[PDB]
Design an enzyme around this catalytic site. Structure first.
Site, PDB file in Angstrom:
ATOM      1  N   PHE A 133       0.849  -1.178   0.000  1.00  0.00           N
ATOM      2  CA  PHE A 133       0.000   0.000   0.000  1.00  0.00           C
ATOM      3  C   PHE A 133       0.888   1.232   0.000  1.00  0.00           C
ATOM      4  O   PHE A 133       2.008   1.212   0.522  1.00  0.00           O
ATOM      5  CB  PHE A 133      -0.969   0.030   1.194  1.00  0.00           C
ATOM      6  CG  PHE A 133      -0.279   0.241   2.529  1.00  0.00           C
ATOM      7  CD1 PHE A 133      -0.069   1.516   3.009  1.00  0.00           C
ATOM      8  CD2 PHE A 133       0.132  -0.836   3.289  1.00  0.00           C
ATOM      9  CE1 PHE A 133       0.569   1.723   4.230  1.00  0.00           C
ATOM     10  CE2 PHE A 133       0.768  -0.642   4.517  1.00  0.00           C
ATOM     11  CZ  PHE A 133       0.979   0.641   4.979  1.00  0.00           C
ATOM     12  N   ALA A 137       2.994   9.030   4.726  1.00  0.00           N
ATOM     13  CA  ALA A 137       3.103   9.132   6.171  1.00  0.00           C
ATOM     14  C   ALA A 137       4.382   9.886   6.482  1.00  0.00           C
ATOM     15  O   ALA A 137       5.394   9.689   5.805  1.00  0.00           O
ATOM     16  CB  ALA A 137       3.119   7.741   6.819  1.00  0.00           C
ATOM     17  N   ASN A 152      13.088  13.861   2.680  1.00  0.00           N
ATOM     18  CA  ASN A 152      12.264  14.225   1.530  1.00  0.00           C
ATOM     19  C   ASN A 152      10.921  13.517   1.668  1.00  0.00           C
ATOM     20  O   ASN A 152      10.846  12.292   1.558  1.00  0.00           O
ATOM     21  CB  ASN A 152      12.963  13.837   0.228  1.00  0.00           C
ATOM     22  CG  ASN A 152      12.251  14.378  -1.006  1.00  0.00           C
ATOM     23  OD1 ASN A 152      11.448  15.307  -0.919  1.00  0.00           O
ATOM     24  ND2 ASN A 152      12.541  13.790  -2.164  1.00  0.00           N
ATOM     25  N   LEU A 153       9.866  14.281   1.923  1.00  0.00           N
ATOM     26  CA  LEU A 153       8.533  13.734   2.149  1.00  0.00           C
ATOM     27  C   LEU A 153       7.740  13.886   0.857  1.00  0.00           C
ATOM     28  O   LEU A 153       7.454  15.007   0.426  1.00  0.00           O
ATOM     29  CB  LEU A 153       7.845  14.445   3.311  1.00  0.00           C
ATOM     30  CG  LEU A 153       8.355  14.104   4.717  1.00  0.00           C
ATOM     31  CD1 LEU A 153       7.585  14.880   5.774  1.00  0.00           C
ATOM     32  CD2 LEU A 153       8.262  12.611   4.973  1.00  0.00           C
ATOM     33  N   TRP A 162       6.582   6.686  -7.367  1.00  0.00           N
ATOM     34  CA  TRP A 162       7.844   6.108  -6.932  1.00  0.00           C
ATOM     35  C   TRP A 162       7.722   4.606  -6.706  1.00  0.00           C
ATOM     36  O   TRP A 162       8.575   3.830  -7.155  1.00  0.00           O
ATOM     37  CB  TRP A 162       8.281   6.832  -5.659  1.00  0.00           C
ATOM     38  CG  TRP A 162       9.587   6.431  -5.115  1.00  0.00           C
ATOM     39  CD1 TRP A 162      10.813   6.886  -5.500  1.00  0.00           C
ATOM     40  CD2 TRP A 162       9.813   5.500  -4.053  1.00  0.00           C
ATOM     41  NE1 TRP A 162      11.796   6.294  -4.733  1.00  0.00           N
ATOM     42  CE2 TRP A 162      11.206   5.439  -3.839  1.00  0.00           C
ATOM     43  CE3 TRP A 162       8.972   4.711  -3.261  1.00  0.00           C
ATOM     44  CZ2 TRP A 162      11.778   4.618  -2.863  1.00  0.00           C
ATOM     45  CZ3 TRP A 162       9.541   3.900  -2.288  1.00  0.00           C
ATOM     46  CH2 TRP A 162      10.930   3.861  -2.099  1.00  0.00           C
ATOM     47  N   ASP A 221      -2.306  -2.340   7.866  1.00  0.00           N
ATOM     48  CA  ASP A 221      -2.611  -2.114   6.437  1.00  0.00           C
ATOM     49  C   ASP A 221      -3.968  -1.417   6.380  1.00  0.00           C
ATOM     50  O   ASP A 221      -4.882  -1.882   7.023  1.00  0.00           O
ATOM     51  CB  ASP A 221      -2.652  -3.447   5.699  1.00  0.00           C
ATOM     52  CG  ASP A 221      -3.200  -3.420   4.292  1.00  0.00           C
ATOM     53  OD1 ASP A 221      -3.444  -2.377   3.800  1.00  0.00           O
ATOM     54  OD2 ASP A 221      -3.351  -4.451   3.725  1.00  0.00           O
TER      55      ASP A 221
END
Length: 315
Positions: A133, A137, A152-153, A162, A221
């Site tokens: 998934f 976050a 790096n968010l 990605w 999950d």
């Protein structure tokens, strides 16, 4: 071997990697007692971290579930956590570590599985299912890392792109690659995979019948949280697969979320050869103790991170 030399660089970077001892569990997919030759389920936890000197750079937690039948294994690989620390400037691209490590874990077949009440020999025919998934976050693994200068968010769409790129690169030739973005219309979902000829919209599980008999309940999950609710409210007898995914789209985690997405890939009828590959294996309690210590580290603080790493190296 897990990582190529250009990344480890003869000790500039170091790895933490260990597995739990393989442990029998109840099936994460509900098996009607009716079933003729129900499988045994064996679960292995994998924890990986990359170190640079005495700082953690990134971590990856993956659970492998072996559904062992007489003649074949249904092997589920579930990405539980993936995170970065960002205390130092980024030297390697994170995907060039996560990709190879996750491929190593998918293909690992050196588990030492005890007999169900000497080691058990697994069937050579394996059907692989990779389940990921994507959800942006800030600190899935490393507490307080979110405001480190070089963390790096990614936003949700960037994170999904990605993951699709990583997963596509390690599932070449697999039988299907499925993407679902619950609550998104089909043409918005299709845009993420328009350049990936092997990908299609949907999911990898049984399409008909009761949701609980088709969809695995993985820990922590977003899909699993809804499954949990269906079970605790004892609606496992009425909720179909199609209705489950329809209603999943309206859960708070999805409807208020940022491109929360579900990826699954399958490879059918792979003949594998079981091969020993000595890695560190630990009891469940030792594993949980490590994760509980991690939970208490301030990953914005190089002192605490260095101390955590040296304590792990110590023993």
């Amino acid at each position: 071997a897990m990582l190529p030399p250009d990344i480890l660089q003869n000790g500039e970077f170091e790895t933490i990697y260990f597995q739990t001892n393989p442990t029998y569990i109840k099936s994460p997919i509900h098996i009607p007692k009716s079933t003729i030759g129900k499988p045994d389920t064996v679960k292995i936890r994998h924890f990986f971290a990359l170190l640079h000197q005495d700082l953690v750079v990134l971590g990856l937690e993956v659970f492998v579930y072996l559904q062992i039948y007489s003649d074949f294994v249904e092997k589920y690989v579930y990405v539980s956590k993936c995170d970065t620390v960002g205390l130092e400037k980024s030297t390697i691209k994170i995907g060039k570590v996560i990709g190879p490590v996750l491929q190593y874990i998918i293909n690992y077949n050196g588990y030492k599985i005890k007999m169900k009440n000497e080691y058990r020999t697994l069937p050579k025919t394996q059907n692989l299912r990779l389940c990921v998934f994507t959800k942006p976050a800030k600190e899935a693994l490393f507490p307080n890392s979110a405001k480190n200068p070089y963390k790096n968010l990614l936003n949700g769409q960037s994170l999904l792109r990605w993951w699709i790129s990583i997963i596509d690169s390690i599932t070449k030739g697999w039988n299907n690659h499925k993407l679902m973005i619950p609550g998104a219309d089909k043409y918005a979902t299709r845009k993420f995979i328009e350049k990936y000829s092997d990908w299609s919209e949907g999911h990898i599980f049984k399409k008909d019948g009761l949701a609980v008999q088709a969809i695995p309940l993985f820990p922590d999950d977003p899909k699993g949280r809804f499954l949990e609710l269906v079970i605790v409210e004892c609606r496992y007898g009425k909720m179909t697969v199609s209705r489950f995914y329809q209603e999943l789209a309206y859960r708070q985690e999805f409807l208020l979320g940022d491109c929360v997405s579900l990826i699954g890939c399958c490879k059918e009828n792979l003949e594998v050869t079981y091969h020993d590959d000595l890695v560190s294996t630990v009891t469940i309690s030792e594993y949980k103790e490590f994760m509980n210590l991690l939970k208490l580290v301030d990953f914005s603080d190089r002192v605490e991170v260095s101390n955590f790493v040296s304590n792990y190296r110590k023993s």
